[PDB]
Amino acid sequence: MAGAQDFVPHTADLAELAAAAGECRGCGLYRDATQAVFGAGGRSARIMMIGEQPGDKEDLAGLPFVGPAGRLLDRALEAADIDRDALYVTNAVKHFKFTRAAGGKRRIHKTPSRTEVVACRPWLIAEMTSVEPDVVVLLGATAAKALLGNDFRVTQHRGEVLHVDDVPGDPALVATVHPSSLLRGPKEERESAFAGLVDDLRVAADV
Ligand SMILES: O=c1cc[nH]c(=O)[nH]1
Ligand code: SF4
């Protein structure tokens, strides 16, 4: 598949890239979503962070990581002494994939297929080309697999500094737990997992 490639313009300007993502039809996810959600921040960023996809909040705000997972993430960044205004924050897939359940308090996100990730990956390539980050934080399974391969296991490479040639700039790559995984479950387990997120964020910051 060609995917998003036909829709990515020959430019490194983020505002231009964001606009053209708004017209992307490189998989079927544009149809039900409200709008594309491009990355936030600037091309001076040293650290890029990539999540899975916009959720419910993000689909309507037009910005990444503005819901509960994003508030958790801010708490982690803060403890790692990282200013979020200095990052470029984005997602592997740029349109919200979702459903609704009866009695639901919100739209429930559905995991992008590997095919959708590969379809949308040209946007990530363009973002990386535009920003030239020194390090990329891969937030959770989908984002990590997008760069590291569909077989990659986030849980097994926590806190490791990774590199593949496959990527623009040969930044270091640090794969970590998705902040939404820390929202729920037993208290000791959340707190432990949170401490590891802070650690992995510091690994990325010290590259
Ligand atoms: O931006 C976001 C928000 C929630 N979950 C993600 O993966 N990315
Ligand atoms: S999800 Fe990515 S590839 Fe699919 S339509 Fe939206 S922007 Fe294009």
Side-chain angles (χ1 to χ4, degrees), residues 3-4 7 21 23-30 36 92-96 116 119-121 123:
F7 300 96
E23 304 297 329
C24 191
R25 298 189 312 286
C27 72
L29 297 181
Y30 75 96
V93 163
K94 303 262 195 299
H95 283 96
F96 187 27
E116 292 159 332
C120 202
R121 190 169 62 193
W123 289 112

Side-chain angles (χ1 to χ4, degrees), residues 13 19 23 26 66-67 85 89 99 103 106 114 120 125 128 134-135 151 155 159 173 175 180 188 201:
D13 189 272
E23 304 297 329
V66 289
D85 300 336
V89 174
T99 200
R106 68 188 166 273
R114 172 61 175 191
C120 202
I125 302 309
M128 286 186 295
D134 297 340
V135 58
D151 199 36
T155 55
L173 309 170
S180 50
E188 186 166 4
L201 289 168

Side-chain angles (χ1 to χ4, degrees), residues 53-104 106-130:
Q53 59 177 314
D56 199 344
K57 313 311 196 171
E58 289 76 20
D59 176 74
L60 289 141
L63 303 159
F65 278 111
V66 289
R71 289 189 280 279
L72 187 131
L73 178 61
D74 293 338
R75 184 164 58 88
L77 293 168
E78 201 274 340
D81 187 48
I82 300 172
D83 185 3
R84 182 174 169 166
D85 300 336
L87 306 175
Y88 186 81
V89 174
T90 197
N91 292 291
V93 163
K94 303 262 195 299
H95 283 96
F96 187 27
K97 187 190 190 168
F98 71 89
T99 200
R100 257 182 218 279
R106 68 188 166 273
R107 294 165 304 164
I108 301 311
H109 80 268
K110 289 305 148 158
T111 303
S113 62
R114 172 61 175 191
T115 306
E116 292 159 332
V117 177
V118 168
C120 202
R121 190 169 62 193
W123 289 112
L124 226 57
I125 302 309
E127 284 165 305
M128 286 186 295
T129 295
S130 168

